[PDB]
Amino acid sequence: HLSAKLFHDKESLLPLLKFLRLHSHQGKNLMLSEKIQNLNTLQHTLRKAEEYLAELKSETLYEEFEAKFEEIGLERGWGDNAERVLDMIRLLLDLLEAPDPCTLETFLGRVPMVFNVVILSPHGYFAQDNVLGYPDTGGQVVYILDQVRALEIEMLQRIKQQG
Amino acid sequence: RERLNETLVSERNEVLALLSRVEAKGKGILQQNQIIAEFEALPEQTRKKLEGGPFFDLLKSTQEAIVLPPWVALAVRPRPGVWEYLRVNLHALVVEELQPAEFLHFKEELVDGVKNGNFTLELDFEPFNASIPRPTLHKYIGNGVDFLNRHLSAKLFHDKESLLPLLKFLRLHSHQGKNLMLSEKIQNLNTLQHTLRKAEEYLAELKSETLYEEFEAKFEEIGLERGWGDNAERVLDMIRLLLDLLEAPDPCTLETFLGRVPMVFNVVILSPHGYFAQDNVLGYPDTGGQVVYILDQVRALEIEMLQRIKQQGLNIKPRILILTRLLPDAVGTTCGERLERVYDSEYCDILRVPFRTEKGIVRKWISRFEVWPYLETYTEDAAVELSKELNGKPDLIIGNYSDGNLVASLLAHKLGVTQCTIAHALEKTKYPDSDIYWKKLDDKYHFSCQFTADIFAMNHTDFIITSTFQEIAGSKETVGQYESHTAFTLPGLYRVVHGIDVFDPKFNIVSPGADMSIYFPYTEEKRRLTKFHSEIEELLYSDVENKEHLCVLKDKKKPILFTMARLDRVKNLSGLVEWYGKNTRLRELANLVVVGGDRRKESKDNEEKAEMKKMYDLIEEYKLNGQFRWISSQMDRVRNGELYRYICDTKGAFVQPALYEAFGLTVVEAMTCGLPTFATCKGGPAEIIVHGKSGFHIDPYHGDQAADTLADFFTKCKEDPSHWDEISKGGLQRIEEKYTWQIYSQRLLTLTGVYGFWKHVSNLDRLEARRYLEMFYALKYRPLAQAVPLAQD
Amino acid sequence: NEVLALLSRVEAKGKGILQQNQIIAEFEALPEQTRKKLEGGPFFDLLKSTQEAIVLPPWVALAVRPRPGVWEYLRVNLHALVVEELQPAEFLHFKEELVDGVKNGNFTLELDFEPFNASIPRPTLHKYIGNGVDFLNRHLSAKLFHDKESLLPLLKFLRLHSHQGKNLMLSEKIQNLNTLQHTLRKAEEYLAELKSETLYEEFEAKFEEIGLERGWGDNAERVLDMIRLLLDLLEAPDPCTLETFLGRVPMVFNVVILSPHGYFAQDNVLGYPDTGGQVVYILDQVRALEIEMLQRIKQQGLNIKPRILILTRLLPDAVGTTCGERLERVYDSEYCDILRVPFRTEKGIVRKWISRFEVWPYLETYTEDAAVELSKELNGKPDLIIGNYSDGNLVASLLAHKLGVTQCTIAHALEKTKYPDSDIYWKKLDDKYHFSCQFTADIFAMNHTDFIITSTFQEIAGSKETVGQYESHTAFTLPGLYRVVHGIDVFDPKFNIVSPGADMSIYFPYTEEKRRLTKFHSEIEELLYSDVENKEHLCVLKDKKKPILFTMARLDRVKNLSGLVEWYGKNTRLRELANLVVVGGDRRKESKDNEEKAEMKKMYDLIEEYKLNGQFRWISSQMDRVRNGELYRYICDTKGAFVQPALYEAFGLTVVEAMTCGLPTFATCKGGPAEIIVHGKSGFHIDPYHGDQAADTLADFFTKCKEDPSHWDEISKGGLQRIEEKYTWQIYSQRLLTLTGVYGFWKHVSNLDRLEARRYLEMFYALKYRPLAQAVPLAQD
């Protein structure tokens, strides 16, 4: 539905640009800066970034091209190296051009977002010991402790891959 | 207008950078593109140039600088497919913004002395394009099907009226009175949604390998005819893909489903000009890579069609016709027989139809530039014959080259059939400034007809196939072949404002190949044909001078510098022979063997004739006897294959010195055998070859540098024979990756489906462009075509 | 009735290979058969509705016209029945074989304009035919309603709008709908508290500040109304509001009118070949138009001075006329001028008058020269361009395109309807009439123009029983040349019927005595009743007291004056009752026109053959309208009548003039006069195809009038009233300027769709017209 609604529609695309521009964590800018006010500059800047990156060695760290990227309006979180930053910029350029569902997901899922997470489990005796089997204490408690551990490994990773 | 700014920089680099603007205006009244607009004042300047700053863009992107009034008309190309043209004054401060149809107006004032008429024709196809939006993104150039898919995938998503066409499409679909896919039972999406639902449960239960014959009974009941699959497993997938499009269309699915619907049964391929034959032809005027491409293409195609028909659960038998001219008088050939079976195919047949006038058929061969008056009556006739040969109507028409695309359009329109074009070359890029200088070239080359027909076909066709990206958008530095038709002018005739857009979703790149049984690595000894080594050794090292071969090779042991091609001005064989003759170091390292032209018979082609006079003269001038062997056309590919490998034994190289080459199958063949290849950087081979890895590039405009580059190569190879083996393996790998026949057919068939379905939805949007084209042909081409003198028997 | 139809279809095939028209396509078949008809049944009415049938030996093709604008084409095997529906193009093949023995080249041109018109949906109702601006308003109204993307064009249109460097409407300070919206109510607040009469000068200060430039009105009352109009349009657009607003915006300042063919002058011309109601219409028109143009410009608080140029051909050797001078002021106008420019070639200026059918080779250069000349004359470029007739519409198109101006066209006649079967038989007629050229330009300008003005509904959709003038261009064919599948549509919103009138200074009732111009009576009595025979008049009237049957018109084939004379000549009874006075041809000179010459010889022989002396007075062309007004009134004094025996008449200005004067009128039923007159009420209709019947009818009018004198007055007053309603110049001028506003704007909104049409038309002009036109032989001095 989003892939189809996004295909060559201005009033549609803005939301995605507003998103990346507003995106920040703990007082740091991510993705696009305030330098990019419209799809034209964004389109132009991405293309501009792509020409540059397609030149560099794949394993080149973001810190190298950081200065330049800051110039043209690109904040951190596209990836930790040239290769990664490249696929990502190429991904968004594509959403602007010919959106497909697989692209759309891949990009949105890649954008660093989830950092802080709040999980709700009020009832029961919720603990890591001396509990399981008490009234209301059971599969929910187990699931949640496994979930967070699994969740934390994935986040540290996504965070590190996005530089 | 970014390129009118960095040039505004005459405020900084001025007293230097207005010099190059001098040494140009100092040549005068002409066009110099690139190498001349560049190898001019910049290289021929002094170190007070020092223009290596921000200026080096606008000159590096020009493509032309046309000397002019106290004015310079120039062009600039920021990115493939994006246009800026400049006009500035030398000493007058005349620099002016230039917006298209205005810039052309300045090209006309540079010939006629004034621009074209007033109400003289402007050709703009842009407004007829508005149906789909254009990709602005480089990746989609030559990828259009991928773009059209996503446009359809979206347009299809939860739109009632929008899915109807797909139902109607699958509902009407039939072949020779057999109904396929959906029967007439299913009148609406709800019934189809449901009927498909019912079908799925049933099939999910059956074993994967259950034949369609079992459940055929059930299906006919619910409205499902044949063409879904041969067994249950297949029918299942297919049914699932259709359910999917009805719910959440995604591009990948839409393509796959349209890909599989059994569609292409009878193919009709247009190739009127030349001597089209499978033996005793190649090397003749107008007879060349296009004939090889088509013969290889059809064989490949026939196979894919067979296994697509089998998989889809159908026994229908395909037929592929190759339409071409019947030349009753070409003797020593089969060109005089109406029907001929293609080698190694069950269903591919050559179908020959004669040209004719009200005075009866025309027997004599005719140059490809002169066939124009004949083509419309050819179409009518061909229609009649292929109606005879074909069972039902054509499911695809492929046009080839210029005359071929002209006709295939008329048929496609007449019969209402999906159409594809393949240019195989576009003369405007091959014969420079033939657009603007057209009027003087006309009585020889008749370019007013050819261009007209090329423009007509590009826009008439459903999709276009190119063999490379370069054939469309060129490169960063240089303009592409099709691209160069976006805006041009034929002063006194008409002015093409927007003729084509490289971003058009109809461009698809499908790269051909070299037949693998004919051309393979010289290293596989089991495969080598030694039966030929006597003929070949006579061919090369024989003592005799005759119509088959000229001069002689004193030293039998040198590496051979080899080339083979039709003989005409553009192939530039006379060029290479000269470069070699002037460079003593190359002559010592290698023998030069050029195969081209047929000297066994008197030549009837103007260029062929002119080329021979130059060859003849050079041989004497450069005293080539003993280092040079000029061999006549080799019409048998099997032995040609072994010839290439033989050249490998001598550890030679292959050189292709064309002023322009559209694709260069010889390049592909040479590498497929493993022969390290040096080829012209102008046109297709720029893309085929990767410099210093899979081969080397040379510039036909600097020949002396080419001859030396080669001398270098042989020198290194003498010091380090492993250097040869490295380039050899590089070529072998490049071919194995990019150029092969296996995927070609699949791509091509898939395309026919996607574009076939598409042309139903877009039916109404195109209706205007259709009348615009009808008129262009009738009121533009026809008058021009009847203008051309008829051949006289 | 399976055994029945086979019969009529048999009787049809009996006449063999041919086509026949709807009169015959029935009037022979149905009636000429035995009582075997017994068909009042539903099959019948395919026949009754058939406009023509084309019969080729196995086949009969049918063109059916159920309602104006609605066509069905069928084929029928003359034996075996088997009715099969055919597409227009295929019905056209039928005609083509009928002439060439074969259809047009498989690859020969089909003109189809339908796919280019689709921007607006088409009205299907009879009422919107001729009423297109009404339709287009409702469309723009809806389109505009709470759509920002749709409202922007309105803001930009107004923001860019200017004349000759003076900004108008909105300044550049208004960049968007909020600012416009906010500013407009700011202004409205302010004006509400001013006295209505406050002049725009007082608050002009404020406005400039907030982005409001001049042209909203003269006083505060009027700037307020317009502003409120715009507020509404941004808020809740309705059709009426939209139209009032657009018709109000000052636009038309300079107007250019194209009328190249003929001798265009204010005196010493009328009745000369190719010179007639078009010169009359245009002159009346520019007058009325300048009046309104001035009030509008004044009412909007603008001080600009308008200009109207009538572009026509400079004829150096026309003598006794003003056709040799380059600029001529129009009588009773401060701002209207005739601007003459010569035809010319590589050899230089062409001196001799050339027939309308021959001007084609010259028209493109004319355009360029015309352009250069009106650039010197006009202050700023043209705000409106009106093409007239074919040469006129053609040039109007090219100039409009060249200059980027809103174009209107007026046909004044369409030859295809004047010269039956001149489309299908075009080849044998071409050497003489060059219809391949004309039809081509007719089609070109018809489509290329921004809108169209007709003088009747008949001009578009004709009547219920018969085909209209533009209607007959919907689908037709020129064998061996090209085929028009859909060339025009009677429902195209571009059509507007704006009826013209007669100058009411010149034409009034014969019963207003103080007004009659008596000083002309000596001249008229000599003109009519004198015993002298010369190049001014032939024969003589023996009995002075009889009533006069009066006609006046250009002299040529179609006007059918030679017919009228023969009718009269054959009919003794009419001859006893009334004297026939015909005015046509200028015999003072040698006739340079083919038809005029031919018609003259016919006249002479009719005189001798029917012994017309004593009942018949043949007067040369009366070139002065003022005395003409009184001449009409004189006929009334005698209780006579005006008759107009044309085979076809596009509009009939003389028919309007006669009526305006009180003179009972009998006019042809073929073309415009069929709408103008109401049989038995405002006048009568006669059939030029049945002449003797026409005469008998006239005899009858006079007899009735003889016995009862008040019958003459019923009709006299009947027409007087009719003209008072449908035909006057008062609303014309205002309607026209309104359309220029609506269509002026609509062309900004629709501009992107007219692009495809632009290129189509360009290529049609270039690749089809030009080559045809050049083929026309040039004149020689």
Ligand SMILES: O=c1ccn([C@@H]2O[C@H](COP(=O)(O)OP(=O)(O)O)[C@@H](O)[C@H]2O)c(=O)[nH]1
């Ligand atoms: O005495 C107990 C009772 C339960 N469990 C654990 O609690 C979970 C029970 O979850 P389940 O989803 O099976 O049932 P639920 O408690 O969610 O209703 C399982 O991991 C058990 O191993 C346990 O460890 N000790």
Ligand SMILES: O=c1ccn([C@@H]2O[C@H](COP(=O)(O)OP(=O)(O)O)[C@@H](O)[C@H]2O)c(=O)[nH]1
């Ligand atoms: O004497 C000759 C000359 C030409 N060729 C063949 O002609 C084709 C030429 O194709 P290419 O694209 O290289 O040049 P083209 O003629 O198509 O412009 C190649 O397959 C060659 O092997 C040949 O077999 N013998």
Ligand SMILES: O=c1ccn([C@@H]2O[C@H](COP(=O)(O)OP(=O)(O)O)[C@@H](O)[C@H]2O)c(=O)[nH]1
């Ligand atoms: O000898 C003549 C004949 C014509 N008229 C005028 O020319 C016009 C004829 O216009 P109409 O539309 O009736 O005929 P048209 O010439 O346009 O076909 C009328 O105003 C007549 O009064 C005239 O003044 N003298």
Ligand SMILES: OC[C@H]1O[C@](O)(CO)[C@@H](O)[C@@H]1O
């Ligand atoms: O309903 C099952 C119960 O067990 C839990 O999993 C807790 O361990 C909760 O979901 C709920 O209290």
Ligand SMILES: OC[C@H]1O[C@](O)(CO)[C@@H](O)[C@@H]1O
């Ligand atoms: O223009 C090059 C020529 O060579 C061919 O390959 C011959 O088969 C054709 O493409 C064309 O006629």
Ligand SMILES: OC[C@H]1O[C@](O)(CO)[C@@H](O)[C@@H]1O
């Ligand atoms: O055929 C009709 C003729 O009548 C006129 O109105 C006379 O001026 C012109 O439009 C045309 O020449």
Ligand SMILES: [K+]
């Ligand atoms: K951000």
Ligand SMILES: [K+]
């Ligand atoms: K079917």
Ligand SMILES: [K+]
């Ligand atoms: K303004």
